[PDB]
Each structure stands twice: as structure tokens, then as C-alpha cells.
Amino acid sequence: ESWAQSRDEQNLLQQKRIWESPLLLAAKENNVQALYKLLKFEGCEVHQKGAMGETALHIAALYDNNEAAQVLMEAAPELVFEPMTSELYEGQTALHIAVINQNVNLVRALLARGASVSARATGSVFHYRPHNLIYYGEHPLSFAACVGSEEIVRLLIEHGADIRAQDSLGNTVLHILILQPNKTFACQMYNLLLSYDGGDHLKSLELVPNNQGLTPFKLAGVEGNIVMFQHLMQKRKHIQWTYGPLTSTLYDLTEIDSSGDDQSLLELIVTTKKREARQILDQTPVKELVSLKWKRYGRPYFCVLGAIYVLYIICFTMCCVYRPLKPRITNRTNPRDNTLLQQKLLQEAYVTPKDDLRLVGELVSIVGAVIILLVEIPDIFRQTILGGPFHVIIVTYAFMVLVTMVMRLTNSDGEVVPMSFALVLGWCNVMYFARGMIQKMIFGDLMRFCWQMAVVILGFASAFYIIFQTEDPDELGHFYDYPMALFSTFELFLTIIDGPANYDVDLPFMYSITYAAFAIIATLLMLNLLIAMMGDTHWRVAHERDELWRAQVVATTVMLERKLPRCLWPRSGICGREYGLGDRWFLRVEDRQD
Amino acid sequence: ESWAQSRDEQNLLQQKRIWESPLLLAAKENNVQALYKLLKFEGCEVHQKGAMGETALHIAALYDNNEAAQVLMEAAPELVFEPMTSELYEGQTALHIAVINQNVNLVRALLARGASVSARATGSVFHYRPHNLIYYGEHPLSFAACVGSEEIVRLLIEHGADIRAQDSLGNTVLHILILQPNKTFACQMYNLLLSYDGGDHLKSLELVPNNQGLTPFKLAGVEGNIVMFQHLMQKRKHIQWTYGPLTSTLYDLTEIDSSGDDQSLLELIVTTKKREARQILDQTPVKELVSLKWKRYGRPYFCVLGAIYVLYIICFTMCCVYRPLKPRITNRTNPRDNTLLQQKLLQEAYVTPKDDLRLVGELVSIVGAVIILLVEIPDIFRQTILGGPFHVIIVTYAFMVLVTMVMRLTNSDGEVVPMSFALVLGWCNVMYFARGMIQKMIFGDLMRFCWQMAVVILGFASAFYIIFQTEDPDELGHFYDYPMALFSTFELFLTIIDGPANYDVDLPFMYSITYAAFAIIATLLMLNLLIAMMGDTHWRVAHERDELWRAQVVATTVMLERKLPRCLWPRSGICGREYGLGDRWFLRVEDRQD
Ligand SMILES: C[C@@H]1NC(=O)N[C@@H]1CCCCCC(=O)O
Ligand SMILES: C[C@@H]1NC(=O)N[C@@H]1CCCCCC(=O)O
């Protein structure tokens, strides 16, 4: 008995009471004579409320009967004010129904009789829910703006409709227009509502924010309304001059940039689950913005921070390729003949000769891990991937390094399990740096594979080495040497080598786990390659393959700008103050036309 | 603080000084009364220079104010001559601004007052740089030809505009027109400028070359301007006769052929990084040219030179399959039990019985290598691949043969390393010979794979044989025989055989290197195959797959014609001298129309 089933039952139940009540039936059928033979002579009590708490006038307004409505208003002018007392339509008056149906004569008549232009239809039907086919708001002015009836709109303002009115979701009439399907026609209606504003700079209707802190301009970008966005952009751009085909226009660049508490358009576009907002970046005030962010400041800091990461990880493996080794003191090798451990645990490290060199290497692996946690853990409190899952991996990597540290200081046997996870987590997070025209697009996506593949093998050969650095190399000796390890793992990448298989000997728990993940990633990269080899030249889907990368580059650029300090990464555009336009920062864009 | 940021600041700074200076503001706002209330009565000093070193007339010219400009010229006729004293617009007069905006009345008025039609706008904005949205030149005549205003063009010639004028890049008005987006409309403007030429055969405006030695016709081909190219081709073709649908036209074929110092159109098309010029080859005077070059002379000499290469390489392997062998004199085999060398060094060669047969074979491998260097090393001094990287490989191959020679005469142990590189470099450079309708296109690209694959295995099986010709065949005996070697390497091509793997035995350094390159090339050829199997029938992209090969065939044809001597490869077309048209060589082309 879902909700809907209820309204399905009520809509059927409404038509039943309309069938049953002759006053309500006559109001529906527009039976003029039957309304006089009922109201004037032993006529039913007028204030009848139907199945949906509707009056006879409500029914008269629903079906566009003006003759029958006018009879009901002259016999009982009280009704006009009565709202729908039902739960589905709590607050809806006969004026709401008259406005939506674009019954100008009935609207004009109800306004004559003094209908409330401020009545809030707070019924459950009018809620902004995916199970409601329309969302127009609460006030009757808001209904007229959505049906596109400019006649009713001004006719409502003439009778004192407050354009600043907000509904239960803190949405002005401007917010609701941007949430409408007919975008190209709502632009016209949007200008009509702005004309009736107070005409004052202060308390502007375009500035009144959503209950979720969204001005209509900002909501247009988050909702992916291209038509309303470009239209709203006209009010906030200034043409400096026109030199032949060139047009140097100056953009406002205010609500489209940082230093919103978190309120940047850019941050709202990259963090929303609306794909449709992906396209807002690509508009002519915004695309120029992020491309300049990325050219200088963006691309260099990414490669610098990336190169630092490359060194911080190659140092971690430098400490892993040479980790403390002990012999199999134990004779237990002889029992469990399957066992092939030459197990190493050592706390002989303190006395040091080529041991201290690692220690400072291990110390770097720790101070970098906490630094990683010092910049990402305070960031989860204030979560989307577009960039890629770099942040999820970068914290779990430092988690494994800290565990391996806590694994040490206890001389625990399972040192390998958390230490091996950090190897793949560390390196595979390197190929996220990979971020730094159909053919050129074939070669572009191919170099990303060569980048991702060499990165994967440098994390799994590193891992596979540790897995078998303890075990006997006479049986299952694929990785006796890092150099071999690399070359074996490389060949294992392409299925050329029957991967490391033994069955008489009990191989450690890690291999059967680390190799299973290696076998999957190696095929996905070989599958992500084929799609990049066909998908590039198969259609203009390449562009689809394309923005996504550009959208990822933008998502990364916004990330860099959040922690990097103010001294680095200066603000975009040019500030306006002396030069004399100014507190807002402006972007200078010039375009050629042909 | 990039350059651009500067001009972004200056354009904002200009509008500030315009805001600040009432004379400059009135010149912008076209305030006629405010210009009289300032110049006639205690008016500001006129020769005010703005933020961009601009006069009030410059500002008056920028925004199309004629009433305000006429006031400034009658109150101070001096201004007309003043150029922009700024660095961004050094040299720009008010006439330049009037010409671009197509303000005929202001142009006519400035010419009345005697404006310089030879003023060079040498500012940094007007430079031919990718960060400038337009490039029109320096002189005001050159501005009018680019905006398409034929009225201003002739109006400038009437006042003595030199059509032969060249800018800082040695570009005539003809050169600049070909560098314009609107190609179909610039053809019309191009004819208007030619009419005012001296009318003499000598000192023709179409013959005045670029500062980079490019006539406008030649520049059209290098820039890939199809519309200007076909248009300029009309002036240099002659219709012999018309026999029904047939039309035997005779083409000039002068600036489109060799014996330019290096100045052939063809050499300029094949060596430029402009893809767009790829399409110039395919025009109806040029496509007929290269196809005749290729049919006879081109295709045969390529196969002849190719067959010679095939023999010169099969001889090098003939000396490599049977190279001096010595035993492991040393007991060192017993130490380093991993070592599996039956190492051969010998200087017993001099005494000879089936040894001399190789020596003359080795001697051929040397005289051919220097001959290779005798034809490519003097060619680097006077670098693009289209043909493919054949030249880069052919020199490094001879480099390895010379090293192997220097490796000999020293009895060095590492003989194998440079000698094995020459094997793959020699053979894989053979499949460049591969150069010699969707389905037929499927079978066409498939035979190139069968050509490239058999060539690859004949270079790596040759290499793998040498790598294990010294090592023990009882362990890792994939290549004990060239015949086996071939068959193993063939199977290793298709991943059928777990490639040569051993871990108890220390395999030589080369295998882990030569096999890694074999594993990559074998997959790319199996990936270049799939794209040729789908890409052929997936769309008319096959053509895209297609010209590229035709463009490579043309690039190879131009290569052959450079070193081959004059006695071979006669000149294309027919010479004109008695027959009596002549010093230029002409190509006879007849076309049917339907
Ligand atoms: C037709 C019903 N009868 C009536 O008197 N009011 C209702 C109007 C239906 C509108 C439902 C709008 C929505 O889907 O939210
Ligand atoms: C508008 C500026 N003000 C002015 O007096 N001259 C400038 C003209 C701008 C042209 C820039 C051409 C280019 O991009 O190179």
C-alpha cells in the first residue's frame, strides 16, 4: 500500500464523490440549470467539501467551467477563500487552479472578488519530489511564471503579488524558473519578474539565496541549465571595446570563484552528482577561467607535488627491497615439509652500519605518512571522486605504513601483509599523476597506458619480491632479485609467463591474494586500452571520452587551490580596486567572430 | 605575471584613464557638447596621451564616433598624424583604427586630412603570434584587404598605398590574405590587389617572396589553403583543347617541383608539421604529378633498393649465424654454478678454410655500413618522419656494425650486445619496404602484417640465437638451431609458448632485454592488426587510414629523387623549349566531366 496507491485510490475516490454529490457533479459537468435548481431551490448546502476537501468552486475551477463557477461565486462568494482542506492539497485555493489552467476570465473574476495572491499551497502534491510531475512552488504568482502566462503574471503583480515570496524550500520565483524544462521560454519570463523588483541595488531579487544557500545564478550552474546560465551571464559582463572582429568583454567572475565559505560555482559543479552540470564549466566565462588556472600554477604544482610523491614512494620501496633479514633459526623447516620459510625477524637493527641509511629512509616514510594524514584526514570532516580515487588510496596507504610501524616495535610475524599493501597503494596512486584530433588522441590514450602499466609493475614486482624474499628460490624462483622480479612481473603482465605456480610447496598467503589483484588490473588496463583504441576513432564519442578528462583536470585544479597557501597560487582575474570597479575580480576575455 | 596578465591589466588601465580624462571620456562617449565646452573654453590640452599612448582621436576612432572625431580633428588637425606611442601599439595611427572598423566616412576624412597610408603598426599586439587573435600586417592597406572592404582598399590605392609593401616578416598583402580564415572571400579580395600591380611581367607582386623564401602561391600549399591554392592554380594552367567531355589542360608545374635550392612545394609539404598541408598533394595539378613519379621510377627503384637491402641484411645474419666459436677454456664454469657460458672468443680466424667465406661477407657488412653512413650522415646536416623512422634506424644499425668492428680488433667479451642490436635494427628496417574498397583494404592491411611479422621474427630469432649460441642448450634450449630458433620465436610471437624462462641458471643480460622488446612489438602488431580489421569497415575512416599511406608513399618518392643521380629518374612533365613555351616544364592532364 504505497503512498502512490493511496493517491491513485483518492483520485478514483474523488471522481466517486463528484459522481455522488450533485452539486459537485454539476460543477464538473457545467450544468448551469442544475446549479440554480439546487442553490436557489432547496439546493444542497454549498460549503460541501469533496473527497479532496474541495468546494464546488474548486471542482468548477478544475474543469474549465466559467459559467458554472460564476454561478457558485454569486450564490456563495465565501467559497473563493476556502482552500483545499485535504492533506494532498493543503493550501490550494480556487485561484491556484485558475492560474495554471490559464483561465484569464476566472483569474480576473477571482481577483475581483479579492482572492489571496499570497496563499501557500503546501499540499504534498506540490512538493519538490521525483514522484511529482511538476514543481511550481506555493504562491499563485509562482504558478503563472511556470505556465508561461505573462498576462496572469502581471495581473497578479497588479493585485499585490510579492515577487520576493519564498516557498518552504526557500526558493524565490527566480529559483523555480531555472528548475523548469522549457529553458528557452523561461528566460523570457525571467526578465518580466525582474522588472517589478524594487529597482534598488540593495535587496535585489537575484541576490536572495536558496535555503541551501544558492542564488538563482548559482543554482543555474549546479542544475546544468545552459540556457538560463548564458542568459544570466549577460547581466554580469561588460564589453570594453570592439576592434573589428575582436570583442574584449569583461566578466564579473564573482559567484564563480572561491572564498565562498565553500560556495564557489566550481566546487559545486565538481562535487555534484549531476552529470548535466559538467557542461557548465565549458561556458565562455568559465572555460577561460579554469584553463588559465591549469596552464600556469595548476600544471606545474601538480607535476612538482607529483615528482615529490614519486620520490617519497621510491624511498618506501628502497626500505622494502632491503628490509631486516634473519635466518630460519628454527628447525621447524624440517617439519611441515610444505613450509618454505627462511623467515626474517630482527631486532639487531639498532647497531648500525648500512642499517642507519634505511632508518632515515624509514623515518621519511613515516613523517610523509603523517603529513599525508595531516592534509587528508582534516579534509574528510569538511566526498566525490572525479579526479579518481586518489584520496581514498592515499589515506589507506599511510594507514598501512603506520600499521607496519605498529607491526614493528612488536616484532610481529605478519610484517609483510600491511607492508605489501602499502607498496601497491603507493605506486598505483602515482599513475593518478597521469593527468599532466582523433589520432593524436590515439597516441594520447596510449601514453597513459605506458604510464599506468610501468607504474603497476613497479608496485606488484615490489610486492611479489617481498612475498618471496623470505621463501626459498629453488622452487618458485620467479622473484629472486628485484631486477628479475621486475622482468618476471612485466612478462606476467602480458600472460606470456604461466604465472608463479607451485603446488607441492606452501606459498605464503599474500601471493594468492596479490596475484589475483594483479591478474584483474592487468586485464582491465588491457581492456581500457582497446576501448581507447577503437573508441577514439569510432565516433565523436572521443569527445565524451574527452571532457571527462578535462572535467577531471578541472576537479584536480580546484583541489590544489584548497590547501596550497595564499602566497602560492594567486587569485584568478584582476582585482578591481584602483582601477576603480572595485571589490570584485574580473576576467578579461576577447573573442574573434567570423 | 605573464605577459598577458599585463595587457589584461592595461586594457583595464586604459578604461580607467578614459574614465579619468574627461577629454578621453568625451571622445569615447561621443559627447559633442562636452568636447566644445573643453577645447574652446579652458579645454584640456588636446595632445593628451592615454594609458596606451593614444590621443583623444584614437579613442574617437576606436568606438565608432564620427561626430566626436570630427570635432577633435577641426580643433587639432595635428592629431591625425600621431601614432600610438605605447609598446603594445607602437605605430598605429587613427587611420588603422578607422580602416578596420570599416568607417568609410572617417577613413575618407582622415585621407582628406592627409593621413599616412604607409604607417607601419609595429606594436606587439599586431605580431604574428598564436596569442594574438588576428594578424593583418602593419600598413593600413593590409588592414583593409583582411576586413574584406573593397571600398577602403581602392580608396587607399587612390591615395598612394603601395601594394608591394612588406611587413617585418617580409609578407606582402598577398601573403597575409592566404593566412586568413575566410578563404572563399579572400580569393575575391586577392584579385582586386593584383589589378593594381605594375602590369609588367618583371617585378610581379605574385613573385615577391616571403622573408622565409615563400611566394604567396607556395605559402598557400605550405599553409594548406585549398581555396586559395585552386584559385592561384587558374593563373598557371592552360587548356589545350576541348573534345566533347574531355578537357586537356596543361599545368605550369614550376614552383611545385624540385631544383628549388630546397624549395619544392613537395619538399615543403612533406616536411612541415602542418597536417592541413597533407591535403594539398591531393589537388588536381599535384596528385597527377606524384602518381606518375611513383608508377614508373618510384615503385621500381624502391623495390630494387629494397631487394638490395634484403640481401645486405641476410648476409649480415649469415655472418652472425656462423660467428667465431671457442670453448670455455676456463674452469670458471665450475665456479658461479649459475654461469652457463661456453664462451667463444677467437683470433684463430686468420688461418682460413670456411672462414674466408664469412670474411668477404663481413667485409660486405662493413662497406655497406659506411655506404649507409655515406648517404645519410651528409643528409642530417641539410628532420621529419612520415616515411617512418627508417633513417633513424638505418644509421644506428651501421653504428652497431662499426662498433662490432671496433668490438673486434680488441677481442672484447661483449661482442654480442652491439652485434645483436644490429640484427633487429637491420631486419625491422626491412618492413619499411612494406610500402610497395573496404574489403580489398582489409586484405591490404593484412598482408602488411604478414610482411612485418615475418620480418620481426627473422630479426629476433636471429638475435635470440646469438644470445643462446654461447649458452648451454640442455637448460633453456629454445634456440639450439636457427631452424628451431625461428620456429620457437614464431610461436613466442603468439604467446603460445611460455617464453624462454629459467631461474636456477643465469641467462645472459641480452635476453631479458631483447625479449622485453619482442614482447612489446608482438602485441602492438597484434593491436595494429585489430585496428586495421575494424577501422577498415567501421567508417570512411579507412580513407583517413588511407591518405596517410599515400602521404607516406609521396614522402618516400621525394626521398628517392634527392640522392638518385640525374641520369636515373628523369624530370617530370615535358620541357617547353622547342616546343616553344619554353624554360618551364609542363604536365599534360586531361579530365572527363559528367
Ligand atoms: C486533479 C485534482 N483535483 C483537484 O481538485 N485538484 C487536483 C489537481 C491535480 C494536480 C497534481 C499536481 C501534482 O502532480 O503535484
Ligand atoms: C582596443 C584597444 N584600444 C585601442 O585604442 N587600441 C586597441 C585595439 C585592440 C586591438 C588588438 C588587436 C590584437 O589582438 O592584436
mmCIF file of C-alpha atoms and ligand atoms in Angstrom, chain A residues 7 11 14-15 18 52 54-55 58-59 62-63 84 88-89 92 97 100 123-127 131-135, ligand 1:
data_model
loop_
_atom_site.group_PDB
_atom_site.id
_atom_site.type_symbol
_atom_site.label_atom_id
_atom_site.label_comp_id
_atom_site.label_asym_id
_atom_site.label_seq_id
_atom_site.Cartn_x
_atom_site.Cartn_y
_atom_site.Cartn_z
ATOM 1 C CA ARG A 7 -3.494 8.939 -4.340
ATOM 2 C CA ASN A 11 -8.283 10.291 -7.465
ATOM 3 C CA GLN A 14 -12.673 11.959 -5.813
ATOM 4 C CA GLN A 15 -14.456 11.127 -9.069
ATOM 5 C CA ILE A 18 -18.175 14.062 -7.628
ATOM 6 C CA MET A 52 -10.071 16.083 -1.560
ATOM 7 C CA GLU A 54 -12.593 20.679 -2.368
ATOM 8 C CA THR A 55 -15.539 23.048 -2.703
ATOM 9 C CA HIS A 58 -12.649 24.052 -6.732
ATOM 10 C CA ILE A 59 -14.245 21.431 -8.988
ATOM 11 C CA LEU A 62 -10.502 22.259 -12.270
ATOM 12 C CA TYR A 63 -12.502 21.670 -15.395
ATOM 13 C CA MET A 84 -8.383 22.529 -0.150
ATOM 14 C CA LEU A 88 -2.610 16.174 -0.679
ATOM 15 C CA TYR A 89 -3.603 19.758 -1.494
ATOM 16 C CA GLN A 92 -4.609 25.310 -2.660
ATOM 17 C CA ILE A 97 -6.367 26.134 -10.171
ATOM 18 C CA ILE A 100 -2.475 27.009 -14.006
ATOM 19 C CA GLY A 123 -0.012 20.213 -0.122
ATOM 20 C CA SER A 124 2.006 17.047 -0.601
ATOM 21 C CA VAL A 125 1.298 17.028 -4.351
ATOM 22 C CA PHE A 126 3.089 20.368 -4.802
ATOM 23 C CA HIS A 127 6.304 19.157 -3.155
ATOM 24 C CA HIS A 131 7.249 11.367 -7.742
ATOM 25 C CA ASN A 132 5.557 14.687 -8.660
ATOM 26 C CA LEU A 133 5.495 15.512 -12.366
ATOM 27 C CA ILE A 134 5.647 19.279 -11.748
ATOM 28 C CA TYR A 135 7.126 21.683 -9.226
HETATM 29 C C1 LIG C 1 -6.910 16.968 -10.285
HETATM 30 C C2 LIG C 1 -7.005 17.070 -8.773
HETATM 31 N N1 LIG C 1 -8.323 17.539 -8.393
HETATM 32 C C3 LIG C 1 -8.324 18.692 -7.747
HETATM 33 O O1 LIG C 1 -9.331 19.292 -7.384
HETATM 34 N N2 LIG C 1 -7.050 19.061 -7.589
HETATM 35 C C4 LIG C 1 -6.088 18.103 -8.131
HETATM 36 C C5 LIG C 1 -5.058 18.755 -9.044
HETATM 37 C C6 LIG C 1 -4.001 17.757 -9.522
HETATM 38 C C7 LIG C 1 -2.620 18.387 -9.603
HETATM 39 C C8 LIG C 1 -1.488 17.473 -9.155
HETATM 40 C C9 LIG C 1 -0.172 18.229 -9.283
HETATM 41 C C10 LIG C 1 0.988 17.338 -8.915
HETATM 42 O O2 LIG C 1 1.273 16.331 -9.597
HETATM 43 O O3 LIG C 1 1.640 17.655 -7.915
#
